[PDB]
Design a protein around this nucleic acid. Sequence first.
RNA 1: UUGUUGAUUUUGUGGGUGGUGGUGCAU
Lengths: 56, 255, 259, 120
Amino acid sequence: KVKLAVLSYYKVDAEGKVTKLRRECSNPTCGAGVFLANHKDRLYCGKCHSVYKVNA
Amino acid sequence: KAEVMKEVIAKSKFYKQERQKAQGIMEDQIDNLDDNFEDVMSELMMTQPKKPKTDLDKEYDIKVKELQLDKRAAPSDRTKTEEEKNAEAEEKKRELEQQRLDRMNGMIELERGVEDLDDGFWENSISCPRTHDALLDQVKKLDLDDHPKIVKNIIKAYQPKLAEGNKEKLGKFTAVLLRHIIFLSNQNYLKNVQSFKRTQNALISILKSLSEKYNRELSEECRDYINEMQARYKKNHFDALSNGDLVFFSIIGIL
Amino acid sequence: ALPEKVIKAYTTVGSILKTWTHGKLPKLFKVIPSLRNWQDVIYVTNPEEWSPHVVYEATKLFVSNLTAKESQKFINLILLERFRDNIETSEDHSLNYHIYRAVKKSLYKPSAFFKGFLFPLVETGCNVREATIAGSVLAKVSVPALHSSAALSYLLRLPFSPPTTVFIKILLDKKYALPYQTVDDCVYYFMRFRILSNGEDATRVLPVIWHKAFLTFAQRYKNDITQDQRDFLLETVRQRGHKDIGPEIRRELLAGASR
Amino acid sequence: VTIEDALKVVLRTALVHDGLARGLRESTKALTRGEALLVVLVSSVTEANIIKLVEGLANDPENKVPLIKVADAKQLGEWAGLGKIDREGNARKVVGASVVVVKNWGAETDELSMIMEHFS
RNA sequence: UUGUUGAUUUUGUGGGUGGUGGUGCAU
């Protein structure tokens, strides 16, 4: 089990600016807010199960 | 007859091979489609379409939350008739009576017999107290007549359902309670015999309820008290023997 | 229309689903829930011609992935129809095991199941055999008390039909902790068959299933109704009590304490 | 009608229409999607990083969403419906909700106007 | 807890159930 996994996906700057550290799944079923899992060779979606290249 | 059996065996085999051939064809098709997934998915992805609840559906969501707010009822079972309860109670008396009779005859439950045992013998908030002192730790400041109240509260505070492991805590408490009952008898009580009688029988009643569910834990403690008192008899003889030892042999017969 | 290449690919997927019995599904079939137009993609796979094994795995695949609103369409349009089609066309009017397991899988999502399978069925000419088969699934699978209480309340508001009375009996047989709002509605249901001005339910003949359901309620929630509700239900028996069940129901009502 | 007593029927009404995003994960998904209309945050969150983030997402220039400060997470969990109701009348087994976000309001009440007026 | 998901499960203690069971009988 991973605790506060959501916290890791995005970051704060001292000015309150929020930045996303993970790419979001392009699938409109996923819509916005579905973050791809970052593997060594591929980006994986937990909802659509689609596979994207890391540097695509 | 034999030729019919061979045809049946041959037909079954001929049917089995067809199924295996069909299974292989199905697996081959699956492999080809999986290889073509990416081409199919991409074209499907490009042609994807662009982005009021039923009145019945609206009511259900309203109901669900309203039912969440409301209180819930406790379920009860059908009441058995007095004859059925008596018939059941009369039955349960029968097997227990029969079970006791067989054991007087030598039936041993592990259903072995006494003769089997005689082979080789001759040739060769509220705190649960895990220890007898710990039970007193909660009960120094309480009066003699208050012992049943605290003891009962300990069982209530650590019932099996409340948390995991409460079975073990109560089982150890069963052994702890037994030593307390013995411990009180050894203590002088001529001053307050009536108060002692109000505690001494009450604790035994609690122990009986505990023994019904913790006979295993009680029996282990009972053996340990049995084993200990020879050792005191092994050095002190009667000076080891006290009122509580007389009390102990009484309680064993009860439980 | 879908891309012609896609149509050919999913057409071959469907042909596999016709005879599929075991193993891994075609990977194309696996990702259908993740598509917006899964309905269109599902149509080209011929849901009516899916083997019972495919229906079981398809229910697993779609109930988990699709949203609650979308799973209701899948249960309503495919699983409900297949459940009806198999019962109607089977020689013994029995349900296939795989479809019987699929309906359990769809029950993993109570809201979609209730709005997609049960409520459409009872409101669309459900028959006794359908209710018995569906009721058995509801009997064995664990269902939430909250979701069931809402479902039982609605069935207690529908017009009387023996197929609906079975599901009312099943839900009562579950021995749930119904909220008193549901209990009052349950009292109202049986209060609507007494002779008073009243509707045809007062003079309507009552099968044994109605009496068994009323005995089922009496044996359990006798401790969760008011004294006035007890009197209303007690005199309902006096007017509509059964020969043999009725006297037993009287005993259970009188043995209960008012809340 | 106090603001806190106003937020009582608020989070209850939004529940009836399935318009509440419950949890840090759901709240952030609502904010990133622009589906959030109101944000309720707990001042007593042990990890300040959670506070910095919902504030940042709520204050994003593209989609500014009103934010509300609440003393305890346990009571918001009760308002979000997490807790269970007992025989007596009091809530029990309540699960603290650090963040709650309103997606769809469901019904138009007078309690709306005060909260929206307060922010304006 | 599911397979990403959101309370639908998991855990411990108690616990009712023979039931998509058959065969005959009486409109």
